[PDB]
C-alpha cells in the first residue's frame, strides 16, 4: 500500500524526476518513448521511462519539461492509450485520469494526440533531450519530427547505477526469493535439465517474483563449458555437476545467481578442488566491495584474474600450453545490476565503485576436454555468482540465502531442509 510499483512509492519516482531536472538547463524537455507489445511476448517497458515513472503500459510517451530555473515549474507529461471500455475489454488501461491520480502526471493526453501535442512542447524549448539512436513505434515517430538535441539515456544511467535504499530492499527481496529457490533445488534429485529449469521457475514465481530475470542456464556435465547454453533439455548424470544461472525479477528489478553442484549430492575430490578454486576467487573479490577501497569494476576484474592464476597454480594446471587463465576464465568478473540484468552498460567500468551500486561477482572455471589436463578436470564448468550492494565501509550480499560453501551445499543436498 502506498507503493506505485513493488518496493517503490510514487514519492521516490517523483524525487527521481526532480533529481534529473536538477541537471537540466532552463527551457529543456526530456522525451522518452516507451516500448510496444512485441508479437505476444510479456511486455518489457523501456527501463529509462519506467525508472522515472513506474509506467508499465505499451505505446506511451513521457515528457519531462523544465520551463524555468525553478524545480517547482517542472511539468510531467504522459501520453497513454486512452481509457476505452471496448478496447480495455478486448485488450485494463489506467487512462488519462489514472496516470495523473496514480502515476502523478501533471498533464496527460491520449497517445493519438502525439503529432499535435509534442511540437507545442518542442517549439517552446531550447534543449531537447532525446536519444536519436535507439525500436518502438513512438520512437520512430518522435525521431522523424526532430529529423539542440542532446542524449539523455547515459545521464539517466548515472542515476540508475546508484540504487536508493528502497531499490536495494526490493532487489534484496528478489535475491532472497531466488536464493531460497536454489536451496530447495539442492535438496532434490533431477534427471534432466528441463525439470530443474521448470522447478526453479515455479519457485521464483510462487516465492513472490514476477518473472524470470533472464533466460536461464541449466547446463549439466560438459554443457557447462558452453557459456551461453540455454537449451536446458539434456539428461543429467550422477557423475557430473550442473551449472545453473537463473534468478527471478520483482517490480522490474533483477536478481542474478549462479550455482554449481554435483548431481549425485556429494563432491568428489576433483570436483571439490575445482569448486573451491572458484569459491576462493569469488570470496576474495566480494570482500573488496567496500566503497572505501575505491576499486573500480575493472580493478576487481584484474584482481580476479590474479587470484584465479594463483588458484590454477595451486591446482598445478596453470602452465598448460595454449590454455592461459583468460581461456579457462574467459569472461568478466561481473556487471552492474538493476532494472536490467546487465544494468547501466554505458557507465564507466574504470571509475571507483560508489555507495549504492549493485554489482555481481561471478568468476568461473571451464576446463576443456584436452588430454593436457587431468581427466578428472575435463568438461567441468563452474560459476558462482552473487549480487553485492556497495556500502561505505562494508557490503551487503543480496543473495546470501543460496548456500555455496561445500559443507553447506552437501548438508542441504543430503539432509534436505
Query: 151: which 3 cell numbers?
Result: 542524449
**Residue 106 assigned ligand-binding role:** no
Between 114 and 353, whose beta carbon lies closer to Mn ion?
353
Query: For the window 246-285, what string marks contact with Mn ion as x by the rule CB under 5 A?
Result: ----------x-x---------------------------
Select from 277, 358, 291, 359 the least CA-distant residue to 325. Answer: 277
385 assigned to a ligand binding site: yes
- Residues 185, 193: Cα–Cα separation, whole Å: 12
Scanning 154-162, 167-175, 192-200, 358-366 for contacts with Mn ion by CB under 5 A, the matching segment is: 358-366
Is residue 245 part of the contact set for Mn ion (CB under 5 A)?
yes
The grid coordinates of residue 114 equal 502525439
* 212 interacts with Mn ion by CB under 5 A: no
Burial class (CB in 10 A: 0-12, 13-18, 19+), 352: middle
Question: Can you list the positions of beta strands (E) in 126-183?
Answer: 127-129, 149-150
107 assigned to a ligand binding site? no
Taking the C-alpha atoms of residue 178 and residue 344, their distance in angstroms, rounded to an integer, is 22
Question: Is 326 marked within a binding site?
Answer: no
Per rule CB under 5 A, is residue 410 in the interface with Mn ion? no
Q: Quick one: which segment of 3-11, 124-132, 205-213, 240-248 binds Mn ion (CB under 5 A)?
A: 240-248
The stretch near Mn ion (CB under 5 A) out of 42-50, 175-183, 237-245, 265-273 is 237-245
Q: Is residue 362 part of an annotated ligand binding site? A: yes
Out of 108, 304, 360, 399, point to the residue binding Mn ion (CB under 5 A): 360
Total residues at interface with Mn ion (CB under 5 A): 5
Q: Is there a contact between 196 and 244 (Cβ–Cβ < 8 Å)?
A: yes
Rank residues 385 and 410 by Cβ distance to Mn ion and give the closer one: 385
Q: At what angle do helices 153-160 and 10-21 cross, to 10 degrees?
A: 130
Sheet order of strands, 358-361 included: 358-361, 386-390, 395-397
Q: Please, which of residues 23-62 interact with Mn ion by CB under 5 A?
A: none
| Residues at the interface with Mn ion (CB under 5 A) | 245, 256, 258, 360, 385
Summarize the annotated binding site for Mn(2+) as residue ranges.
Answer: 245, 256, 335, 362, 385
Amino acid at each position: 500500500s502506498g507503493e506505485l510499483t513493488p518496493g517503490i512509492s510514487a514519492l521516490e519516482y517523483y524525487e527521481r524526476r526532480i533529481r534529473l531536472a536538477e541537471t537540466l538547463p532552463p527551457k529543456s524537455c526530456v522525451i522518452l518513448a516507451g516500448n510496444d507489445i512485441q508479437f505476444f511476448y510479456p511486455f518489457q517497458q523501456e527501463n529509462d521511462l519506467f525508472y522515472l515513472s513506474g509506467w508499465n503500459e505499451p505505446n506511451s510517451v513521457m515528457i519531462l519539461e523544465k520551463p524555468t530555473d525553478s524545480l517547482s515549474d517542472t511539468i510531467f507529461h504522459m501520453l497513454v492509450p486512452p481509457k476505452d471500455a471496448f478496447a480495455e475489454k478486448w485488450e485494463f488501461r489506467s487512462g488519462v485520469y489514472g496516470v495523473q491520480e496514480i502515476f502523478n502526471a501533471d498533464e496527460s493526453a491520449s497517445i493519438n494526440d502525439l503529432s499535435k501535442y509534442l511540437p507545442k512542447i518542442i517549439n517552446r524549448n531550447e534543449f531537447i533531450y532525446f536519444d536519436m539512436l535507439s525500436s518502438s513505434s513512438n520512437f520512430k515517430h518522435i525521431k522523424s519530427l526532430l529529423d539542440t538535441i542532446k542524449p539523455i539515456s547515459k545521464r539517466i544511467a548515472e542515476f540508475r547505477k546508484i540504487k536508493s535504499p528502497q531499490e536495494l530492499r526490493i532487489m534484496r527481496r528478489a535475491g532472497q526469493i531466488s536464493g531460497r529457490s536454489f536451496n530447495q533445488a539442492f535438496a532434490k534429485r533431477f534427471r534432466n535439465e528441463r525439470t530443474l529449469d521448470s522447478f526453479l521457475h515455479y519457485k521464483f514465481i510462487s516465492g513472490g517474483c514476477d518473472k524470470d530475470a533472464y533466460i536461464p542456464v541449466v547446463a549439466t556435465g560438459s554443457n557447462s563449458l558452453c557459456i551461453h547454453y540455454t537449451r536446458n533439455d539434456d539428461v543429467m548424470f550422477d557423475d557430473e555437476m550442473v551449472l545453473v544461472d537463473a534468478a527471478g525479477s520483482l517490480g522490474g528489478y533483477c536478481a542474478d545467481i549462479s550455482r554449481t553442484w554435483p548431481n549425485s549430492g556429494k563432491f568428489t575430490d576433483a570436483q571439490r578442488d575445482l569448486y573451491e578454486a572458484v569459491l576462493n576467487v569469488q570470496r576474495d573479490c566480494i570482500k573488496l566491495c567496500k566503497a572505501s577501497n575505491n576499486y573500480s569494476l575493472h580493478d576487481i576484474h584484474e584482481k580476479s584474474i590474479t587470484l584465479m592464476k594463483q588458484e590454477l597454480k595451486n591446482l598445478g594446471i596453470d602452465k598448460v600450453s595454449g590454455w592461459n587463465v583468460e581461456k579457462l576464465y574467459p569472461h568478466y568478473i561481473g556487471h552492474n545490476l538493476g532494472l536490467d540484468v546487465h544494468d547501466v552498460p554505458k557507465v564507466s567500468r574504470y571509475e571507483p565503485l560508489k555507495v549504492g551500486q549493485v554489482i555481481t561477482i561471478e568468476p568461473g572455471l571451464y576446463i576443456p576436454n584436452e588430454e593436457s589436463f587431468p581427466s578428472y578436470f575435463r568438461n567441468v564448468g563452474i560459476r558462482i555468482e552473487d549480487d553485492i550492494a556497495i556500502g561505505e565501509d562494508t557490503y551487503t550480499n543480496l543473495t546470501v540465502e543460496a548456500v555455496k560453501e561445500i559443507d553447506d551445499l552437501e548438508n542441504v543436498m543430503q539432509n534436505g531442509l
